[PDB]
Amino acid sequence: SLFKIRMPETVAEGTRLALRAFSLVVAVDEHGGIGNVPEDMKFFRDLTTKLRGKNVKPSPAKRNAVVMGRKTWDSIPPKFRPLPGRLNVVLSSTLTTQHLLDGLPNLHADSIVAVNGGLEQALRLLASPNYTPSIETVYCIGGGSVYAEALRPPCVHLLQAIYRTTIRAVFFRVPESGTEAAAGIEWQRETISEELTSANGNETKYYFEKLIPRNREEEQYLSLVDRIIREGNVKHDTGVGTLSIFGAQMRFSLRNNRLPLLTTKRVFWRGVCEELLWFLRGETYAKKLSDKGVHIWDDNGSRAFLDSRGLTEYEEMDLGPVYGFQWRHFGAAYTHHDANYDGQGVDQIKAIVETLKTNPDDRRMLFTAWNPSALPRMALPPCHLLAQFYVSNGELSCMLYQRSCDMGLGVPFNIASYALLTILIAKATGLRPGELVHTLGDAHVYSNHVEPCNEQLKRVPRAFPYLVFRREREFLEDYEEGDMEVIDYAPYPP
Template sequence: MASTATPLDSRRENHWEWQYLDLMRRIWEQGDERIDRTGVGTRAVFGAQIRFDLSAGAMPLVTTKRVYWKTAAREFLWFLTGETNIRPLVQQGVKIWNEWPHANYVKQTDDSLSVEEFAARIAEDEAFAAQWGDLGPVYGKQWVDWPTYEPAGEGLFRPGPGINQVQQVVDSLRTNPGSRRHIVEGWNVAELDRMALPPCHKTYQFHVGAGRLNCLLYQRSCDVALGLPFNLFGAALFTRMLAQQCDLEPGELVWMGGDTHLYLNHGALVEAQLAREPSGGGNLVIKRRPESMFDYRIEDFEVTDYAPQSHIAAPVAV
């Protein structure tokens, strides 16, 4: 019997990004519309999945618009330092966290300083950055320095040594690869109210099968237009780095979203992106193997064969 597959069907089967575009289309056309925390409003679905094979250096880089992968990589390396102040990011030209401390600064001071002026002052003035640039105990703090407490007598407790979840996962992958406890968790209930933004990409679980390292990322809240392309790259980078450190081959990345949404003011981006077709891809080369997960530098990463279509701008909802 002759095949009934169309050229479009063939392209869909061969390019992972159709999963992303189909999810975007489903949300925009069928999602539940409601007012959200930011007041902007969203269309959302609950429960979504994207799968990507990381073998042969492949990375889940969206091609229907440009993803600034170095920005995502710099953010991920910042997480691994345990740092929670935006100053190191700002000094590298990374702007993705600026809006949250800026909004807090304006609220607290009634100063009309623009976000660009605020970021410049963060970069130049260490004391100003110390006062206004901290985000609270966000991602990196939980990943590498999860707080513990120990008895201090008569019902009192004092801070104990922090838990480095990332190093624990490295150790467990090396010594007990069959474990079902290779998890890095960001959702510390006791500290959520101190965070500028509670973790969205909250739970990473790793799994070893046939010498391949697989990753499942559960994201409680996902901005599909702006956040998800970064989240996919970050999770893939995490997996690639762990695989190198643990003498494993990269396997499959499975992304799962809880509240998976598009902001109503992203309509122009959505329409423009859905009018495009994915093509090509991107591969990541890690140029050296550092002594630990915490010794990588941005210069260690090189992306090849990535030729995306033009950038599409859209506002960030804070």
């Protein structure tokens, strides 16, 4: 219909996943050389086989993948060939899938694939819809030529984690920080075990490490939470205490499918996405969200809360002309939720989408919910209250201004919410997703969240996950939470 935003033909193009991300698992000697420790084989099997979910039996619907060179495949004892419970992807210029099957002594057909190519070719195959998102983690298991390719671009930028066992008994060398070979990645240890002793009868000495690429973007957030606790002003309102500072700014890359969902505490993505779509549709009835099991508006849509605003005539969960209402119908007269507001008010989102397509250098491509005429008719004044877009080199960037920032729960939710908005607007306009800039006004931690924030500040952030689209829609307003999926999200535990 005429009021919706039609997606262009290029809709899938700038979000298509080029290479699937992966982790590396390697054992080396004390000099880093890669040429019988059962505890290491126990760790290898568990780390490469188990899914992150509670009690999930690996199957073609949901399992890990192991990627290896043809010589590593040859050297697996035939008892464990193919590695059971994993997809086995084997790199070879010589051997087809059929030849690998012919080397066994039909059970295994869905679990073995040959790739005539290197690790990059294997990551390109694993990014296709038959394997993403069904493969949960891709593990690269060598050998030396495959590790070399994993540790240089373009593959190295998709390496989430390196699991290295060192055993006191061609070198595996992680690029050093600041060096050309590192390509701007700063490798750091998340964990390193004590020196351990094998029960193998030889008293073999070994230790494990897990390295991860330093995530300076989530570090920004961490630094700000640490500063608010160490130096923020205490205020009490009802008497709820907060610690606060005023004025800050963070930036996050959305390029090549990255999604900045924080890793040091899990973000409720399903909630982020349902809510953002609800904003984009211009919705105002919060029951639409609570009926999908997203309860973030229940406190502010209650009879009691609405009455406390003077909104006595609103039905329960009708929030008035909040948010998406102003995005799609700024200044329209509001009566009740779900009336026909087609063509009323200013549709700021449609207008920006049209400008992005025809004049992407325009400096007025902004939208707002802060409408002081409508403020008193809203359950709450918007907190994320405007955003502005910018284009460079065919990439779309967005800056968000947020007046009141709960660092514990609101801010990580809003980062994700605006990352997703930017990605969707780039898909609507022929552009690739660029950077998200988040400006913060009053940035606060509730005083009862101080000890848990301190516990969270103990954690070293991990690589962010990625966003892919399983399918597309003819109109921007018809997107659904099931159309897209977050892959490679590995947050720390609660």
